[PDB]
Amino acid sequence: LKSKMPSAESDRSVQYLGDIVVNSMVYGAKLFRQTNAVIINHNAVIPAV
Amino acid sequence: LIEDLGAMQSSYDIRQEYTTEAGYALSRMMDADILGLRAAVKGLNNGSEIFNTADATISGASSPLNYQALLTAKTILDNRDVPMEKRVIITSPTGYNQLLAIDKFISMDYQDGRPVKSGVVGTIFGIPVIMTTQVTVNSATGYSNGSTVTG
Amino acid sequence: DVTGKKGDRFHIPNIGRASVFDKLPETPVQLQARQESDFYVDIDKYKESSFLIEDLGAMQSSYDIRQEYTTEAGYALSRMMDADILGLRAAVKGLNNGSEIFNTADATISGASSPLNYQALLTAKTILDNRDVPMEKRVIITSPTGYNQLLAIDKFISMDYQDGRPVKSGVVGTIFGIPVIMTTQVTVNSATGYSNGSTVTGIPTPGVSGAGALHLPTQDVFTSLPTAFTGANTGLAAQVITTLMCHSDWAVMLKSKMPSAESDRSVQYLGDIVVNSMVYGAKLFRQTNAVIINHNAVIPAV
Amino acid sequence: AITCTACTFTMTDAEFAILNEGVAAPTIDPRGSFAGLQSLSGAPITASASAGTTTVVVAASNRNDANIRTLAQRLRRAAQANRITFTA
Amino acid sequence: AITCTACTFTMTDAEFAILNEGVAAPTIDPRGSFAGLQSLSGAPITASASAGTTTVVVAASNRNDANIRTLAQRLRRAAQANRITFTA
Amino acid sequence: AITCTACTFTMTDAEFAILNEGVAAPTIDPRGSFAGLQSLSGAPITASASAGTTTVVVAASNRNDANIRTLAQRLRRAAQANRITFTA
Amino acid sequence: ALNNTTYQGSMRGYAVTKSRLDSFIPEVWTGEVLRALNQNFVASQYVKTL
């Protein structure tokens, strides 16, 4: 769910003589179909030959 | 927050570097949140988990990503009527190089390319294989949230 | 190429990675600032080979002595430059960031050593890939022993896996997309197996510390390359060869002056003085672009 | 062998907290003026404080020229930026 | 108040003679590597000898960052040029 | 079989130092006049100094015709070049 | 060996070496910086997004 892509809003901090840049994103993630994914658990062994 | 005094004296475009780092960090966070759904897939408990061990459990002799595990995953997906046109295999570089060590994925008798010569392996069972560093060995201290937040 | 530059130190700032934080209610955003380090490189090596030839031996001899000395001086300067570059394997070992591979049974120095085989190259490629090192400009630099050990692997010589004839021609093709280069400068790591000319012999090989060492890194923290395989390893299995799988950004070389020759006439000595000189510096540039594989000098049976 | 036997600086706790991102004496903040130095044998900067005074030194095996130069430069920049007197 | 309370370097008499243009410990040669510094209260560099060891110290009231930085840079350049080991 | 049982030369320490390029007796200087011979069992030339005189002998298993001839020729050339007297 | 110390040399005084030119040899910032190596993000393309 894609509510807001990472975007940057800029403001002038005059009390600090600086630039405030805030990059933000808004989203959600879930499992749509519970049958369309499989996970395989293996090891990190590089085999011989 | 970037001060004007520091930015006017440095010979490098500090604001551009900071903006690029922020954008990269946000994209990386989004990608990692997407890839963290393997835990949800594991918690489904509908049979979508495969243990690549001798007895298909956590206490068996572990085996690398091999032909049998991929065939079992393909069979599990096919038995569920999952379409074959938009499938993908996402694995760590360790998994990619483990696939590089299987005879049926590197020999000309089975596949049309030269993975040993070129270092890249083509589609396996018609499913393209995608390598990402974002997937790593599952550990509780192997990830970082920037240069200051590690572990 | 700083041949036209004027300074002696060169600085390259580092940039880290930003953090991502959850925006909580009624809480201002966390501002992020990083105190970054810089990579500095010096012009600290100034090398020379010189010789004075007197007139008596020049005219009594039927051979062209000056040409031989000039040629060997130039060759020695090139050899010193190349060996100084190759001595950075000690710095790579001294990084202690997982860039060293022991090709043994238990991946330690006390295990049963194995030659440069399929598993070692695959492990090095995996280590480089896990660091997001680009695949474009990788290279494998090894001794002729390692290059010929690569000939004993069926996967690199059969037509079923590659498109060359290493058995016919003796030349192995590209391995995992990474070309393999053979050089005699990479030797068996020993403390008395290298020579600084015909008059200085028995000095340690590049990257190995000892009495008379000359190619140890001078700008990086280094650990001397291992010389023997501890444990039950004996004979050729106890010898160590350090192959280097690296991307071009693994190290940096400042070129201040290429070897150039200057001649003069010494009347008081009645001779000719020739001086060949070079100015350069060598340092380790990126901390992640090099991997060193420690194997043995055993040719496997196949 | 040219060795640096001591590169020591003394500050008050308030000024050290100003320089060390508000962190107390024995801890060096990664975002402070004492972080980001070239590390050769561990933490290059060590700080302590007993009688309201903070002593900041370069570590025993990290006293190369680059660390000393960078520490001096950062101390200058922090002192003149924060208007902290540099009596020495 | 940020004060540098110790900036000392230890050498051998031979290396110091190489760097001080062949002059002994207590005298600083004007053409040597320890000359040409900024003088705020007198001679900015002092040197002493004790049993083959020469200690070079920035003067008490001359320990600004400029003197420390320049001394470290001179020592680094001299060690690199003369092939003298600089063990931290 | 024709074997050479002894090939011995004797000189003073000063003359040996001239011929050995200023090096002492037991060490054979590789840029000297006693180096560069044919090696068959190790160092073909050995030297020993006693009572202010140096004795130079070909090694036990390196006493072939070429080594003897080259040693004699080199001794002759060095003596003539350095104005050193050779005796029958 | 050119090790005879009984002759007279021709060099006296001091020479203008790179060490005596300390104030004239600068430190150079070439303008190049070292980024970290960027990762590859591909998961977003293999998920149904709305």
User: Any chain D CB within 8 A of the CB of E10?
Assistant: yes
Hey, is the C-beta of C132 within 8 angstroms of any chain B C-beta?
Answer: yes
Residues of chain C with Cβ-Cβ distance to F31 below 8 Å are 199
Q: Are C225 and C100 in contact (CB under 8 A)?
A: no
* Strands (DSSP E) found in C153-250: 180-182, 194-195, 201-203, 241-247
CA distances from A37 to B29, B62, C107, C129, E62 (A): 21, 22, 35, 26, 71
The answer to whether A37 contacts chain C (CB < 8 Å) is: no
Q: Decide if F18 contacts F34 (C-beta within 8 A).
A: no
CB of G47 within 8 Å of a chain B CB? The answer is yes
Residue type, E11: M
Residue C118 contacts A, CB cutoff 8 Å: yes
Minimal CA separation from E71 to chain G, in Å:
10
Residues of chain G found within 8 Å of residue A1, distances taken between Cβ atoms: 50
Residues of A in contact with B29 (CB under 8 A): 25
D45 by Cβ neighbours in 10 Å (0-12 / 13-18 / 19+) ranks as buried
Give me the sign of the Cα torsion angle B15, B17, B23, B25. negative
Structure tokens at B60: 């068996």
Structure tokens, G11: 């060099």
Alpha carbon distance D85, D75 (integer Å): 11
C39 to chain G, closest Cα gap in Å: 8
Q: Is A47 on the interface with C (CB under 8 A)?
A: yes
C270 near G CB under 8 A: no
Chain F, residues 4-23, CB within 8 A of chain G, namely 21-22
User: For residue A17, which residues of chain B lie inside 8 Å, CB to CB?
Assistant: 3-5
Subunit contact C122:B97, Cβ cutoff 8 A: yes
CA distances from C222 to C107, D6, D44, F4, F81 (A): 21, 24, 17, 52, 49
Q: Which residue has the tokens 């130190």?
A: C9
Q: How many CB pairs under 8 A join C and E?
A: 4
Beta pairing partners, C141: C181, C244
Chain E from 59 to 88: CB within 8 A of any C CB: 77, 80-81
**CB-facing half-sphere around the CA of C36: CA atoms within 13 A:** 21
Residues D7 and D68 sit within 8 Å (Cβ to Cβ) = yes
Cβ-defined contact of B2 to A19 (cutoff 8 Å): yes
- The C-alpha atoms of residue F81 and residue F78 are separated, in whole angstroms, by 5
- In chain C, the residue whose alpha carbon lies closest to the alpha carbon of F29 is C199
Question: Which member of E3, E4, E75 has the closest CB to residue D2?
Answer: E75
3-state secondary structure of C68: helix
Query: Which helix (H) or strand (E) segment is F54 a member of?
Result: strand F53-58
**Touching chains E and G? (3+ Cβ pairs < 8 A):** yes
Rg (CA), chain B: 21
Residue with tokens 């009495």: C211
Alpha carbons C9 and C85: distance in angstroms, whole number: 19
Resolution (A): 2.8
Chains near E (3 or more Cβ pairs under 8 Å): C, D, G
- Touching check for D65 and chain E: CB below 8 Å? yes
Chain G neighbors of F30, CB-CB under 8 A: none
Please tell me which residue of chain C has the smallest CA distance to D37: C37
G neighbour chains, 3+ CB pairs within 8 Å: A, B, C, E, F
Whether chain C has a CB inside 8 Å of the CB on B72: the answer is no
> Residue C50 and residue C18: Cα distance in Å, rounded?
54
DSSP designation for E70:
H
Sort out which chain G residues have CB atoms less than 8 A from C132's CB and list them: 37-40
**Strand, helix or coil at C193?**
coil
CA distance B89 to B67: 13
- For chain F, the distance separating the N- and C-terminal CA atoms, rounded to the nearest angstrom, is 27
Question: Are there at least 3 beta-carbon pairs closer than 8 Å between D and A?
Answer: no
For residue G27, the one-letter residue type is E
* Nearest C-alpha in C relative to D40: C221
Closest-CA distance of chain B to residue C6, Å: 19
Single-letter amino acid, residue C188: V
Interface check for C166 against chain B (CB to CB < 8 A): the answer is no
Q: Would an 8 Å CB–CB cutoff place C130 in contact with chain A? A: no
DSSP C190: -
Residues B1 and A10 sit within 8 Å (Cβ to Cβ) = no
Q: CA B103 to CA B110: how far, in whole Å?
A: 9
Q: How many CB atoms lie within 10 A of CB F62?
A: 21
Q: How far is A45 from chain C (nearest CA, A)?
A: 9
- Going by C-beta distance under 8 Å and a sequence separation of 6 or more, which residues neighbour residue A25? A4, A5, A6, A7, B26, B29, B30
**Residue among D2, C23, G4, B135 nearest E74 (CA):** D2
Q: What is the rounded CA–CA span in Å between residue C122 and residue C103?
A: 11
Alpha-carbon distances, residue F46 vs B116, F35, F66 (angstroms): 58, 10, 17
Tokens of C271: 């001779």
Q: CB of B135 within 8 Å of any CB in chain A?
A: no
Instruction: Taking the CA atoms of F36, F37, F40 and F46 in sequence, report the sign of the dihedral they define.
Output: negative
Return the residues preceding each gap in chain B, C–N over 2.5 A, or none: none
CB D15 within 8 A of CB D55: no
Partner B contacted by C136 (CB < 8 A): no
C16 by DSSP, 3-state: which?
A: coil
**Closest approach of B46 to chain C, Cα-based (Å):** 32
Q: Is C155 on the interface with A (CB under 8 A)?
A: yes
| Contact in structure between B51 and B57 (CB atoms under 8 Å) | yes
Largest CA distance in chain E: 38
Distance between CA atoms of residues C242 and C294, nearest Å: 5
User: Using the beta-carbon criterion (under 8 Å), do G41 and B131 form an inter-chain contact?
Assistant: no
**Contact of C274 with C50, CB cutoff 8 Å:** yes
Tokens of C118: 């399929």
Q: Do C19 and B28 touch (CB under 8 A)?
A: no
Gap between the Cα atoms of D46 and D56, Å rounded: 6
Pair E62, E39: CB distance under 8 Å: yes
Indicate yes or no: CB of A2 within 8 angstroms of CB of G50: yes
How many Cβ atoms are within 10 Å of C288's Cβ, its own excluded?
Answer: 20
Q: How does DSSP classify residue C175?
A: B
Nearest residue in E to C47, CA atom: E81
Query: What span, in angstroms and rounded, lies between the C-alpha atoms of F59 and F42?
Result: 8
Give G15 to chain F, closest Cα distance, Å.
Answer: 30
Residue E41 has which token pair?
Answer: 């209260």
Chain G residues in contact with F21 (beta carbon < 8 A): 1
Contacts of E54 in chain D (CB under 8 A): none
Q: Does D30 touch chain B (CB under 8 A)?
A: yes
How far apart are the C-alpha atoms of G46 and B28, rounded to whole Å? 15
Is B12 in the C-facing interface, judged by CB distances under 8 Å?
yes
- Nearest neighbour of C132 by CB, restricted to G28, G33, G37: G37
Shortest distance between the Cα of G31 and any Cα of chain C, in A, equals 7
C123 close contact with A: CB closer than 8 A: yes
Closest CA to D66 of C282, E77, E56: E77
